[PDB]
Amino acid sequence: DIVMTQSPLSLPVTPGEPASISCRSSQSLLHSNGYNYLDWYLQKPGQSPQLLIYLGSNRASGVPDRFSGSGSGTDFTLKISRVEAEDVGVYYCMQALQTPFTFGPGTKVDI
Amino acid sequence: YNYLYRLFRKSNLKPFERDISTEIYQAGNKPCNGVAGFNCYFPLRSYSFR
Amino acid sequence: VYAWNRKRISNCVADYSVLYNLAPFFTFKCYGVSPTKLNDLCFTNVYADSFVIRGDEVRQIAPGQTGNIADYNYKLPDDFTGCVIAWNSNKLDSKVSGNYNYLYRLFRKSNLKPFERDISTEIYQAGNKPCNGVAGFNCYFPLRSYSFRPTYGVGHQPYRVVVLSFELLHAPATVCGPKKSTNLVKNKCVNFNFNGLKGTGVLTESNKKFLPFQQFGRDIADTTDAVRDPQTLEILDITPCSFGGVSV
Amino acid sequence: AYTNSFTRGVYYPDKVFRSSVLHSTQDLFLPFFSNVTWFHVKRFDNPVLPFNDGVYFASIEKSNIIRGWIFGTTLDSKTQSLLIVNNATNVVIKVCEFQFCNDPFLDRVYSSANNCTFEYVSQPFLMDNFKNLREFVFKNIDGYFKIYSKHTPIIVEDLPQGFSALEPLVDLPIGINITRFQTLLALHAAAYYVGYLQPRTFLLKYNENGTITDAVDCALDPLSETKCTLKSFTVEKGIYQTSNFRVQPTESIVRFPNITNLCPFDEVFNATRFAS
Amino acid sequence: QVQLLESGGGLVQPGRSLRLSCAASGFTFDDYAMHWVRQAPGKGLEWVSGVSWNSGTIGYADSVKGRFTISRDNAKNSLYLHMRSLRAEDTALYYCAKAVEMVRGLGADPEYGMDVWGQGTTVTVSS
Ligand SMILES: *[C@@H]1O[C@H](CO)[C@@H](O[C@@H]2O[C@H](CO)[C@@H](O)[C@H](O)[C@H]2NC(C)=O)[C@H](O)[C@H]1NC(C)=O
Ligand SMILES: *[C@@H]1O[C@H](CO)[C@@H](O)[C@H](O)[C@H]1NC(C)=O
Ligand SMILES: *[C@@H]1O[C@H](CO)[C@@H](O)[C@H](O)[C@H]1NC(C)=O
């Protein structure tokens, strides 16, 4: 029963520059272990979604090192160091601490 | 339940020896001090002959 | 309990003493063997069945028992040769709004066979009209939900049950008990047992080159001369504690 | 083709250490001086050879092309079988059902995980400018599965003239019905051999370190029979008695005088009218 | 290669039942927490239900609680999602995803990391 939001709602990015997206929650996701349970997913339009970051900032397997995740408490950020023509779609942040899980409304990135 | 039996004991029996003492059993590294509880088994349990 | 999970266990030594050294496992009803005795016993395979039930239905997990759990959910055979472990868990398994992650089969046309699992949700046609998959008069959903609550009664408070079955049938044993390496007494004459090799004599320190895979050492008349220390890969000669013909 | 296995295929029959003694064992061995099946590789060959009792697999391999083995009797997910592979620095011995293909290859294509029942992981059995000899004795006994190994340099194709024992590499008590084996490798000039072990009685000469240094077969030739009778390698001049020449029976005979009495069953079964 | 195949889609009237099935091939079935996630037409994702490695469900969505019933079968590597009380608002795609962290490989057990996704079905309801 936790509600999360993202900002900006939709931002146009141009290939060759960084971009920053923020995901905000209602309850701090700091566990007793001290790990953040927010995960970042990219659902490309017309294709099944894919994992980008899990466990707050730990990079997912098989993705390039152009993505960076930061934040803690109730604010987390995803920064694409360099954006290109294959970085368009929809981004979501999903909780993994209090069941049931939730997915944010989603940010739409385009050219 | 006129008939009962033993299943836990510190050491096995002797030929023609009838162990009879009603001594609480300690199955753990900790004692029992004559009080029922964890690792505290009464030496005799009863069969349900039906 | 209707969809009970079964974890096959093999290729491993099971320290049963660990769980035997824990008060919370208050209900430790075993049948056909002694826990202490089996800690030096071996089996080919072990099956670990786990599920959660109410407080007072623990008795139903037993051979020759009847009820919703015993007839429709988890039936033990008459010739059961294993253990039953059950404890109360009001904190994790329960909730303040009630738990809905739990189901028990209430209706079924026929009693289960021992260790049979049934996860099919098909309306129990109790009457003579077909149900077509929609609940109604004489048409009941097979499962219902336990309302586990923190303030519930003990007989209704949650309970986790673990059932261990042992079947060493025509199979190379893959599960034995961890009989702790006992002491080793050297230069004083003893009776010894070394990994199924149990003679009598005095243990000593050896110097004979031993190939690593080699275990024993046999002299002329197939006498066990050298034995690899089971833990440390060293060698212990076995020459009978010094003797020499006595003449007067 | 056919070649000569001069003195090859001697594995430690027991984990029992000895020293300077000779031990006339009697177990499943590969007899000396046997015609072994020879293959080599555009032209190739990969049948399903029968695993009769035991295979002294040999591979004079330049650069580690042979990639595991597959054993069983059907190999089509009907019967529980096994698969052994050699990853870059690890090996896997699994026991599952499997469905294969005509040309499984990599840059595989088969049901690796199906109704599985046993798994295994270890270091790379196939260690690694010589065509290093990779002898492996594959055998199963009493419901157990045994393999042996050796890794020796080879200079430049036929088996060498030398004696090398085989340590028991890894044991594994699977115990399933097996009849036919198939080798596995990848091409993108390597020889794999298959002998057949047979019940046989051997003499073995353990050295001062428990290592085998020589072997003698009892049933090869008369002089070897003497050696195995005197329990010695050198045989002094003389006349020895070794065994007993005996002829075997040929066929079977049963005898009985002409039979005259037959039970009157017809009179009951073919009776015109039965009683009430 | 790891494969997640789901089946069970088709037009069904409101007030009926369905049973989606997801088949896994290419990994040890009992060391990954499966998940069921819907995907409404032209909208964002929405978590539906899940199951741990030991066939223990981990709750369903708040707005769907009361009808859905998930079940697991490790012997056949098969996950099923019985659906009850079908209504017009249940038309959407459905993917079955898998966790990433193997159990007991590191505090508690993992449930996050929906990495591999099969192609969802097209369950729809209308009259
Ligand atoms: C008869 O009594 C003696 C005296 O207690 C027992 O000897 C002891 O046995 C216990 C275990 O039951 C050991 O812990 C002691 O070290 C033994 N020595 C002592 C204290 O005498 C003896 O075991 C009893 N007879 C039988 C058959 O158990
Ligand atoms: C356990 O065995 C290992 C060798 O396998 C040894 O190094 C270690 O000291 C032993 N520890 C004990 C005594 O439990
Ligand atoms: C045992 O191994 C040693 C290693 O140096 C070797 O010198 C010796 O010859 C071997 N055993 C024999 C043949 O005595």
PDB file of N, CA and C in Angstrom, chain A residues 23-51:
ATOM      1  N   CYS A  23      12.826   8.922  -8.938  1.00  0.00           N
ATOM      2  CA  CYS A  23      11.709   8.134  -8.438  1.00  0.00           C
ATOM      3  C   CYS A  23      11.569   8.385  -6.945  1.00  0.00           C
ATOM      4  N   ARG A  24      10.359   8.723  -6.510  1.00  0.00           N
ATOM      5  CA  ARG A  24      10.093   9.056  -5.120  1.00  0.00           C
ATOM      6  C   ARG A  24       9.027   8.125  -4.561  1.00  0.00           C
ATOM      7  N   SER A  25       9.189   7.759  -3.297  1.00  0.00           N
ATOM      8  CA  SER A  25       8.292   6.837  -2.617  1.00  0.00           C
ATOM      9  C   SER A  25       7.600   7.559  -1.462  1.00  0.00           C
ATOM     10  N   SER A  26       6.821   6.804  -0.695  1.00  0.00           N
ATOM     11  CA  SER A  26       6.136   7.319   0.484  1.00  0.00           C
ATOM     12  C   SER A  26       6.794   6.892   1.784  1.00  0.00           C
ATOM     13  N   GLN A  27       7.276   5.654   1.859  1.00  0.00           N
ATOM     14  CA  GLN A  27       7.985   5.144   3.022  1.00  0.00           C
ATOM     15  C   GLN A  27       9.414   4.814   2.620  1.00  0.00           C
ATOM     16  N   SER A  28      10.369   5.178   3.474  1.00  0.00           N
ATOM     17  CA  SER A  28      11.767   4.868   3.206  1.00  0.00           C
ATOM     18  C   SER A  28      11.956   3.363   3.068  1.00  0.00           C
ATOM     19  N   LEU A  29      12.677   2.960   2.025  1.00  0.00           N
ATOM     20  CA  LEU A  29      12.887   1.555   1.710  1.00  0.00           C
ATOM     21  C   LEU A  29      14.174   0.997   2.309  1.00  0.00           C
ATOM     22  N   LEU A  30      14.794   1.715   3.244  1.00  0.00           N
ATOM     23  CA  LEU A  30      15.969   1.212   3.945  1.00  0.00           C
ATOM     24  C   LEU A  30      15.614   0.007   4.807  1.00  0.00           C
ATOM     25  N   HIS A  31      16.178  -1.154   4.486  1.00  0.00           N
ATOM     26  CA  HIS A  31      15.925  -2.366   5.247  1.00  0.00           C
ATOM     27  C   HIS A  31      16.890  -2.461   6.429  1.00  0.00           C
ATOM     28  N   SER A  32      16.708  -3.501   7.248  1.00  0.00           N
ATOM     29  CA  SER A  32      17.631  -3.746   8.352  1.00  0.00           C
ATOM     30  C   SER A  32      19.040  -4.030   7.848  1.00  0.00           C
ATOM     31  N   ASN A  33      19.160  -4.696   6.697  1.00  0.00           N
ATOM     32  CA  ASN A  33      20.467  -4.888   6.080  1.00  0.00           C
ATOM     33  C   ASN A  33      21.071  -3.573   5.603  1.00  0.00           C
ATOM     34  N   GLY A  34      20.250  -2.551   5.385  1.00  0.00           N
ATOM     35  CA  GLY A  34      20.716  -1.279   4.879  1.00  0.00           C
ATOM     36  C   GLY A  34      20.655  -1.126   3.376  1.00  0.00           C
ATOM     37  N   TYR A  35      20.009  -2.052   2.675  1.00  0.00           N
ATOM     38  CA  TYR A  35      19.935  -2.041   1.224  1.00  0.00           C
ATOM     39  C   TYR A  35      18.618  -1.433   0.771  1.00  0.00           C
ATOM     40  N   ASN A  36      18.672  -0.681  -0.322  1.00  0.00           N
ATOM     41  CA  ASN A  36      17.469  -0.163  -0.952  1.00  0.00           C
ATOM     42  C   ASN A  36      16.916  -1.198  -1.922  1.00  0.00           C
ATOM     43  N   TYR A  37      15.600  -1.394  -1.875  1.00  0.00           N
ATOM     44  CA  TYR A  37      14.939  -2.431  -2.651  1.00  0.00           C
ATOM     45  C   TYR A  37      14.234  -1.890  -3.885  1.00  0.00           C
ATOM     46  N   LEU A  38      14.490  -0.639  -4.258  1.00  0.00           N
ATOM     47  CA  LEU A  38      13.941  -0.109  -5.496  1.00  0.00           C
ATOM     48  C   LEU A  38      14.754  -0.606  -6.686  1.00  0.00           C
ATOM     49  N   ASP A  39      14.049  -0.954  -7.760  1.00  0.00           N
ATOM     50  CA  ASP A  39      14.683  -1.427  -8.980  1.00  0.00           C
ATOM     51  C   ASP A  39      14.156  -0.633 -10.166  1.00  0.00           C
ATOM     52  N   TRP A  40      15.029  -0.395 -11.142  1.00  0.00           N
ATOM     53  CA  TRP A  40      14.711   0.393 -12.324  1.00  0.00           C
ATOM     54  C   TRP A  40      14.545  -0.531 -13.524  1.00  0.00           C
ATOM     55  N   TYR A  41      13.445  -0.357 -14.258  1.00  0.00           N
ATOM     56  CA  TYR A  41      13.135  -1.170 -15.423  1.00  0.00           C
ATOM     57  C   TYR A  41      12.824  -0.269 -16.608  1.00  0.00           C
ATOM     58  N   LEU A  42      13.235  -0.703 -17.797  1.00  0.00           N
ATOM     59  CA  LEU A  42      12.938  -0.002 -19.041  1.00  0.00           C
ATOM     60  C   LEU A  42      12.059  -0.892 -19.909  1.00  0.00           C
ATOM     61  N   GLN A  43      10.840  -0.431 -20.192  1.00  0.00           N
ATOM     62  CA  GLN A  43       9.908  -1.166 -21.044  1.00  0.00           C
ATOM     63  C   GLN A  43       9.896  -0.497 -22.414  1.00  0.00           C
ATOM     64  N   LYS A  44      10.712  -1.019 -23.320  1.00  0.00           N
ATOM     65  CA  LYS A  44      10.775  -0.471 -24.667  1.00  0.00           C
ATOM     66  C   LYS A  44       9.444  -0.695 -25.382  1.00  0.00           C
ATOM     67  N   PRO A  45       8.963   0.284 -26.149  1.00  0.00           N
ATOM     68  CA  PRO A  45       7.637   0.160 -26.772  1.00  0.00           C
ATOM     69  C   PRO A  45       7.629  -0.908 -27.856  1.00  0.00           C
ATOM     70  N   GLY A  46       6.682  -1.837 -27.748  1.00  0.00           N
ATOM     71  CA  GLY A  46       6.579  -2.933 -28.686  1.00  0.00           C
ATOM     72  C   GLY A  46       7.374  -4.164 -28.315  1.00  0.00           C
ATOM     73  N   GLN A  47       8.105  -4.137 -27.202  1.00  0.00           N
ATOM     74  CA  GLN A  47       8.917  -5.264 -26.776  1.00  0.00           C
ATOM     75  C   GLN A  47       8.716  -5.482 -25.285  1.00  0.00           C
ATOM     76  N   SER A  48       8.959  -6.717 -24.846  1.00  0.00           N
ATOM     77  CA  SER A  48       8.864  -7.037 -23.432  1.00  0.00           C
ATOM     78  C   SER A  48       9.851  -6.186 -22.633  1.00  0.00           C
ATOM     79  N   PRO A  49       9.482  -5.774 -21.422  1.00  0.00           N
ATOM     80  CA  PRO A  49      10.368  -4.914 -20.628  1.00  0.00           C
ATOM     81  C   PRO A  49      11.647  -5.642 -20.242  1.00  0.00           C
ATOM     82  N   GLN A  50      12.618  -4.859 -19.776  1.00  0.00           N
ATOM     83  CA  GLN A  50      13.928  -5.383 -19.427  1.00  0.00           C
ATOM     84  C   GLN A  50      14.377  -4.784 -18.101  1.00  0.00           C
ATOM     85  N   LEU A  51      15.245  -5.517 -17.408  1.00  0.00           N
ATOM     86  CA  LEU A  51      15.824  -5.035 -16.164  1.00  0.00           C
ATOM     87  C   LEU A  51      17.024  -4.144 -16.452  1.00  0.00           C
TER      88      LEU A  51
END
